Write a protein that binds this ligand. Sequence first.
Ligand code: GDP
Ligand code: BQD
Ligand code: MG
Length: 166
Amino acid sequence: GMTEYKLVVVGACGVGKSALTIQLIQNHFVDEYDPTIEDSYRKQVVIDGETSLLDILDTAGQEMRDQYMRTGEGFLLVFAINNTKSFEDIHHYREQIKRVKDSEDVPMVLVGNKSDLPSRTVDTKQAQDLARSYGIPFIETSAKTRQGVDDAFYTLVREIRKHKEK
Ligand SMILES: Nc1nc2c(ncn2[C@@H]2O[C@H](COP(=O)(O)OP(=O)(O)O)[C@@H](O)[C@H]2O)c(=O)[nH]1
Ligand SMILES: *CCC(=O)N1CC[C@@H](O)[C@H]1C(=O)Nc1ccc2cc(Br)ccc2c1
Ligand SMILES: [Mg+2]
């Protein structure tokens, strides 16, 4: 078949991992999705003239994924800009990914979600500082308005291509 990308969306509970994925796939915004559900989804996309099938694992909790973490090609590190703890927790998710791959050079994109919400507690400069330290892009998103959602997933695809021939 066509080119495939194995994508993994990780981050603390409630940051909008499902919302972002549902947005990419169903083109709408869900207000409540079972935070316990962990599942895979497919999306055919055309990115830079390439017809791609995205294979996306939406993680839930931490206590299928084992294989997806070992074989995942790129990762969205998602926090919510109104959840300081979720931002602080990014470190743990990145370290997890590093340890599995035994590599510092894993395709990743830092995602700051819920941009539609007033009075953020995590400023863009904090987010940019962290992404800069990791050597990865930072993209601000809203799963509610869909701003940045395509940017995040397309950018991760391009990061994967930069890392390996597809
Ligand atoms: N206002 C707003 N709410 C969001 C956004 N993304 C997710 N949510 C909401 O935050 C809550 C958690 O979303 P969810 O997708 O379940 O987070 P998950 O546990 O990481 O999958 C839901 O009520 C969503 O409706 C967003 O971009 N803006
Ligand atoms: C697992 C997701 C979760 O519990 N989260 C995400 C970040 C935090 O906001 C936390 C909450 O949802 N916390 C929370 C606190 C007070 C609430 C009051 C009411 Br009336 C309804 C929901 C609340 C959620
Ligand atoms: Mg979820």
